[PDB]
Amino acid sequence: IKQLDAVYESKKGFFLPANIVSQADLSRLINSTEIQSVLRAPKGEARTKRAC
Amino acid sequence: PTRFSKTRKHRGHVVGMRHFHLLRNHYWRPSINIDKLWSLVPSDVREQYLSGQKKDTAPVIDLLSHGYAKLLGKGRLPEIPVVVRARYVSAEAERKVKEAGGVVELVA
Amino acid sequence: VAAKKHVPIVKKRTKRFMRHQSDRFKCLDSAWRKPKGIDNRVRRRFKGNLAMPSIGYGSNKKTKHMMPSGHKAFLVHNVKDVELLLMHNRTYAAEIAHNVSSRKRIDIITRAKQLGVKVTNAKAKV
Amino acid sequence: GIDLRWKHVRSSHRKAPKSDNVYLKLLVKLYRFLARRTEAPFNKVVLRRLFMSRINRPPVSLSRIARNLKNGNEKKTVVVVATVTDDNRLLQVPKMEVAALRFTAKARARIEAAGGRTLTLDQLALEKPTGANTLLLRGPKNAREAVKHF
Amino acid sequence: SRPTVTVFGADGKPTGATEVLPKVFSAPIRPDIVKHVHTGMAKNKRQPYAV
Amino acid sequence: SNVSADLIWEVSRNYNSFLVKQRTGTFSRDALNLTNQHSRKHAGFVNDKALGIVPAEKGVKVIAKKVKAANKPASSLYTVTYKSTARKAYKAIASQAAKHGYRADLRQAAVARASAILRSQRPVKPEPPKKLRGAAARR
RNA sequence: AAAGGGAAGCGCUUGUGACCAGACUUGCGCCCGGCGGAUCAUCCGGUGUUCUCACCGGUGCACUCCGCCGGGCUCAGGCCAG
RNA sequence: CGGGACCGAGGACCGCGCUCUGCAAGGAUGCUGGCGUAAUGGUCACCAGCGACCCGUCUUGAAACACGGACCAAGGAGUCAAGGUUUUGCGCGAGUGUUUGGGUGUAAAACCCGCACGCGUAAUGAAAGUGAACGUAGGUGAGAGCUUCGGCGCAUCAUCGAC
């Protein structure tokens, strides 16, 4: 476990890849204040009443 | 793989001159444009040159060591004097190097 | 126990779809094959001929895979398999796999009786 | 019977990525939520480009970004839904705030050395959930060998 | 700072030593890449057959 | 970071070792899965906060995830055994599922699972004898 | 066992005869009476936790809890029908 | 205002309403009887009414002709390689490609290494040869998106210029 970092530094032509997503916690992102404060009001519920 | 092929789904339904003894090594002259000239300088010293931390020294670039024989003239150069050693050069490339303040030297 | 309340089970067609001319040739299995001959009367759907299966015969989505008691069959091989039906004794019934020995069947039947789970084939190997 | 001379047309655009990238799936979920719950057209365009294939996401270079950063755009956040590449013909990189699907190593290094910022699209969703003050940039679609051969 | 990991002894108890977690443990987890590489790699010890 | 419950669910939603897939439904063998059903809501091994109930010799045994010990499996579970009145067991299970915001969406399933286990622990009744019917079976 | 007045076989729908799979057998909730026990409520100490919720040890002294056994009552229960 | 037939999808409440203690108003309830088993239901055999050409191939526009088929089991026909091309997924990206070879190995695997080389980064001409910025990499009309609401304008298209 102490040699692993040197192992990955010695690989020529390879770097540890950058992810396309910075924060994998989708619930944290969606329910954060920054996103929630700018949303439109909900246009319905998870279940819809039958009209006719 | 055989299981993904359409055959499985179809189961049940079926001038000028001639040059004798051409030697390509005679005509070896790879070219580089002046807009890629500074990329031959290593990144750190290139960054110092472009920032302006080297006001009393000029880079000498050997194109043959990088594998190029002719300096071509696409692009523009910054106002930094560069000595370029090349086997061949175009007139526009020499003109742009001279306006940048350097010199094109001829080598074999 | 009794199954959860459900709509009446409707089978649009109970008769199987027999292969054309399988009644006249023993080398032809009765399992359905779509006729692909250009002049075939079953493929062209002349009246008086065998019907062909189609999506219009599909069962109600609320009652699909239900046995007449209202449960859905779940194949079980041991006591740990039958214990997966702890929260579904009103919707799922256990069917013991054919290769389970008689002693293990006794253990499965005892556990399913404790859990209140219907066993479809509880009288086998007795 | 009913005479229908015209024909109902099934959708001819992607509704989901063909990719099996799990992080792209998470990004698609996030931008599905944003394009359903906001009114900003930016989010709908971003979601559609997250659906797209690689020939429909050509790379954007730093010199292209620097070209579009002129004339009053120097403070807008640049948004690219493809790879951002480095252009070594561009000797001086301006300061820029760029959010991209992915960066090359040299492009990220040169942006950070010039003093700008690189963001992922979920960080972009956190900071600009309505796409305010942004510059949405695409690379050259027809700059391909096959498209030349068409 | 970077996270640490506990070192356990031969008796199964912690020794009091910790080590810095290597950066490879924060790499993206890509099952599609892993499946592609595994499908390719598992065929590399195959011996040929022919009639 | 690179790891979250959403990421683990995307990794293991199509196959994992707990999956039991048949024609009539997909079930899960996960210990932290109330209702034993394969979904993100009930995937206890995926979720950061999760509950699971097993029988004991008498009564039920409830495990809950500890969020600060996710990388320490031997000390990651908070375990309580309820061997008392069923109403007290239901009250405590609903309290640890809903009172502090620890998976309030799971409290109905948790109380139902505890009730099912306690009901299964009762003595079974003898079944009536099978009535023979017809002509070949009767004679 | 059955059918057969110059073909059989097949589709739809009854009937006859033979042979079968299910379903059902009672459950839940109250009100009384009789038993058998105190893992009733509160408080104290320890421990764990989601830090306010629990478990464990003492405390109950039986108008409180938990099972069982007799009744009575309500509700829900299978098939075909009016 | 009567007489008859077929049907009862949905499953807490929310609505539109009315004749407003309530209702026929966003889909059937209430009351009662027999039976609780082969009674209902199902399978098989047969009779009855009605329905119903022998399959495959070939041909042309189609039939007809013609060809194959006594019966059953097992076998039985769009494969692999090289090279292109378009599209999908993936890695890296003005670079890219470890595996000819070398190092190493728990030994035909996995891991590691780099010179050369291929393709791309420049074209054009028979060839000798020459070789891509007037301009914020140009003007004009569109153009998603953004905007300080004046504009800025991606991709792409059209058109006039420049090298």
Short mmCIF file of C-alpha atoms in Angstrom, two decimals, chain C residues 14-85:
data_model
loop_
_atom_site.label_atom_id
_atom_site.label_comp_id
_atom_site.label_asym_id
_atom_site.label_seq_id
_atom_site.Cartn_x
_atom_site.Cartn_y
_atom_site.Cartn_z
CA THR C 14 -57.57 -21.53 -23.64
CA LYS C 15 -56.92 -23.76 -26.67
CA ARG C 16 -53.32 -24.07 -27.81
CA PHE C 17 -52.08 -22.98 -31.23
CA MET C 18 -51.42 -26.19 -33.18
CA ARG C 19 -48.94 -26.29 -36.06
CA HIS C 20 -50.43 -26.76 -39.53
CA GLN C 21 -50.40 -30.41 -40.75
CA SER C 22 -48.85 -31.63 -37.49
CA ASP C 23 -52.04 -33.67 -37.08
CA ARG C 24 -51.17 -35.52 -40.30
CA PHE C 25 -47.38 -35.87 -39.95
CA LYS C 26 -45.76 -37.49 -36.92
CA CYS C 27 -42.39 -35.91 -37.77
CA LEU C 28 -44.04 -32.50 -37.24
CA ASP C 29 -44.31 -31.43 -33.62
CA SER C 30 -47.52 -29.69 -32.60
CA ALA C 31 -45.58 -26.63 -31.35
CA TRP C 32 -46.48 -23.53 -33.31
CA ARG C 33 -44.55 -22.56 -36.43
CA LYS C 34 -45.61 -19.68 -38.63
CA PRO C 35 -46.30 -20.87 -42.20
CA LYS C 36 -44.08 -19.05 -44.68
CA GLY C 37 -45.32 -20.51 -47.97
CA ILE C 38 -46.72 -17.82 -50.25
CA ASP C 39 -49.90 -19.77 -51.04
CA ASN C 40 -50.52 -21.20 -47.55
CA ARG C 41 -54.14 -20.92 -46.46
CA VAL C 42 -53.36 -20.60 -42.74
CA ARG C 43 -50.86 -17.79 -43.43
CA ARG C 44 -53.35 -16.08 -45.74
CA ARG C 45 -56.10 -16.50 -43.07
CA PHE C 46 -58.83 -18.17 -45.06
CA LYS C 47 -61.80 -18.88 -42.81
CA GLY C 48 -62.21 -22.38 -41.44
CA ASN C 49 -58.45 -22.66 -40.88
CA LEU C 50 -56.15 -22.64 -37.87
CA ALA C 51 -55.79 -19.28 -36.16
CA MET C 52 -52.39 -17.71 -35.85
CA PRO C 53 -51.09 -16.27 -32.56
CA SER C 54 -50.90 -12.52 -32.23
CA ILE C 55 -50.52 -9.84 -29.57
CA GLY C 56 -54.29 -9.28 -29.52
CA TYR C 57 -54.65 -12.50 -27.50
CA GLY C 58 -52.52 -11.04 -24.70
CA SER C 59 -53.61 -11.45 -21.10
CA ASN C 60 -54.61 -8.63 -18.76
CA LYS C 61 -51.52 -7.03 -17.23
CA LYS C 62 -53.05 -7.18 -13.75
CA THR C 63 -53.53 -10.96 -13.94
CA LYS C 64 -50.62 -12.11 -16.12
CA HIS C 65 -48.70 -15.10 -14.63
CA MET C 66 -51.45 -15.71 -12.04
CA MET C 67 -52.55 -19.24 -11.23
CA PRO C 68 -56.33 -19.58 -10.64
CA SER C 69 -55.86 -19.09 -6.89
CA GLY C 70 -54.44 -15.63 -7.61
CA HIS C 71 -50.79 -16.30 -6.72
CA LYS C 72 -47.71 -16.16 -8.93
CA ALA C 73 -45.46 -19.20 -9.02
CA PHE C 74 -41.94 -18.87 -7.62
CA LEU C 75 -39.55 -21.79 -8.01
CA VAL C 76 -37.74 -22.76 -4.80
CA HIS C 77 -34.87 -25.18 -4.23
CA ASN C 78 -34.34 -24.91 -0.46
CA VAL C 79 -35.50 -23.31 2.79
CA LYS C 80 -33.53 -20.13 2.11
CA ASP C 81 -35.26 -19.89 -1.27
CA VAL C 82 -38.71 -20.27 0.27
CA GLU C 83 -37.81 -17.67 2.92
CA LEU C 84 -37.66 -15.03 0.17
CA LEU C 85 -41.48 -15.17 0.12
#
